[PDB]
Swiss-Prot record:
Description of how the protein assembles with itself and partners: Homotrimer when phosphorylated. This trimer is stabilized by binding to the L protein. Binds soluble protein N, and ribonucleocapsid.
Cellular localization per UniProt: Virion; Host cytoplasm
Post-translational modifications reported in the UniProt record: Phosphorylated by host kinases.
Name of the gene: P
Function: Non catalytic polymerase cofactor and regulatory protein that plays a role in viral transcription and replication. Stabilizes the RNA polymerase L to the N-RNA template and binds the soluble protein N, preventing it from encapsidating non-genomic RNA.
Protein name (record): Phosphoprotein
Highest taxon above the source species: Viruses
Species assigned in the record: Lettuce necrotic yellows virus (isolate 318) (LNYV)
Amino acid sequence: RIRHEKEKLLADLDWEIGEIAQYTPLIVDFLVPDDILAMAADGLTPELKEKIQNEIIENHIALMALEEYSSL
Ligand SMILES: [Mg+2]
């Protein structure tokens, strides 16, 4: 359920289902650590939505950067 609920959060935050489906479980875990999932616990979305989206984008930025240094 935990991973499942992370993937559902990513959808609820407007990530396209098409791109979520291509995340590996380890990437899901990296993008949506348990502290971020927990943010959504008593529900969205106020602009809790924008808050969490910002947190996940930060993590995705981290991931991307790491892909880019490795190569170059
Ligand atoms: Mg965990």
